[PDB]
Ligand SMILES: CCCCCCCCCCCCCC(=O)CSCCNC(=O)CCNC(=O)[C@H](O)C(C)(C)COP(=O)(O)OP(=O)(O)OC[C@H]1O[C@@H](n2cnc3c(N)ncnc32)[C@H](O)[C@@H]1OP(=O)(O)O
């Protein structure tokens with residue numbers, strides 16, 4: 001790995017190590033006036049396209065590109081299948097820029113073959129809050145891989161973000177790149193045991209027969225926190241206080257405004273689920289998970305694995321274990337087959353007791369143009385989609 005593209009960028013070399021006394025840009029005093037006003041050049045026959053995710057047909061284009069070409073597991077058994085509705089949610093948060101939703105079309109067919117996106121958010125890293133872009137959904141058509149199109153998309157979005165006087169970004173990826181600020185393994189909790197076996201997600205042994213596996217993962221249909229209920233607009237102030245106060249302990253987290261709390265947490269069916277426990281007009285506990293199904297490649301019986309992904313969870317009237325037990329139950333009540341989580345915040349503390357299994361790799365967290373100490377993933381307090 002020579003990282004010929006990445007070593008041109010303001011990111012740590014593979015062997016850079018910085019102390020906690022270092023928490024600053026690689027390149028400071030940047031000037032918006034000096035940013036290139038020209039679009040990056042694409043190979044002949046391809047063109048930039050600005051996607052309007054609020055237009056159903058453009059959003060469908062992006063949906064099709066990612067359905068066919070996005071992230072797969074290591075066995076190329078499953079492929080993420082973010083819904084069109086979910087995309088609309090993920091990309092139109094407060095003060096989003098349409099111009100940071102960038103496609104690349106093949107001119108001869110008029111088809112989208114590449115995409116990259118960002119949204120703006122304030123990010124607190126080691127107690128310093130910085131306006132950043134949160135980058136996601138980088139995708140190149142499977143037919144056009146290893147042609148160095150991804151550096152083009154990354155340089156063009158970096159240009160458009162710099163035009164807004166933003167000079168840092170946050171992103172995650174399963175591949176190792178220079179250089180993670182933190183690295184968090186994923187774990188899963190089986191809900192529909194038998195389906196997870198049948199599609200090859202989970203396995204059995206002579207010691208764990210099918211019926212024993214179903215008994216091992218069986219959950220009581222009663223909440224530990226009885227009044228946990230879907231979040232409503234009235235709860236926005238309360239969730240802003242409860243989650244805001246909790247997040248301040250972490251080395252890395254988004255600093256949400258009230259408008260951001262309403263966007264990111266008010267529930268949308270098949271997209272985002274937030275439940276709250278109100279006691280005396282105060283929000284005292286919250287659970288939230290989002291829907292990210294995967295397409296099950298070449299399966300006769302099942303086309304989709306319906307997966308809930310843990311988002312932000314806070315308790316002050318129960319244990320974390322009790323709260324996360326209730327999160328699994330609420331995911332089961334909404335028809336999910338499995339509950340997935342990263343070893344961030346307090347999550348790893350409940351994985352053993354709650355019957356989570358360890359997955360097959362890790363999600364690396366990264367900053368662009370930021371020099372700082374790295375840290376264990378329990379100190380991460382942000383989850384990207
Ligand atoms: C101030 C603002 C700053 C804004 C921007 C911040 C930075 C945002 C950065 C993006 C954050 C995205 C976050 C995100 O979306 C979440 S991670 C999910 C990324 N998407 C997928 O994995 C979908 C399936 N794969 C693909 O579509 C292609 O394999 C992709 C497009 C990933 C790469 O296409 P390709 O046809 O396989 O490859 P080439 O075009 O020939 O390019 C090779 C170069 O790409 C470097 N590469 C490979 N994968 C990367 C990845 N996941 N991040 C960053 N860099 C990655 C690679 O190391 C090499 O550089 P190097 O030669 O130095 O080693």
Ligand SMILES: Cc1c(C(=O)NCc2cccc3ccccc23)oc2cccc(OC3CCNCC3)c12
Nearest residue numbers: 071072073078079080186294340341342363384385
């Ligand atoms: C990327 C990821 C993985 C992950 O890659 N797990 C392997 C895996 C198993 C089964 C089906 C799969 C389908 C597509 C890709 C991977 C699959 O596991 C997570 C568990 C929690 C959060 C995650 O990453 C978030 C959500 C997805 N986009 C980037 C940030 C991840």
Ligand SMILES: [Cl-]
Nearest residue numbers: 008040041155
């Ligand atoms: Cl260049």
Ligand SMILES: [Mg+2]
Nearest residue numbers: 146147148149
């Ligand atoms: Mg390429």
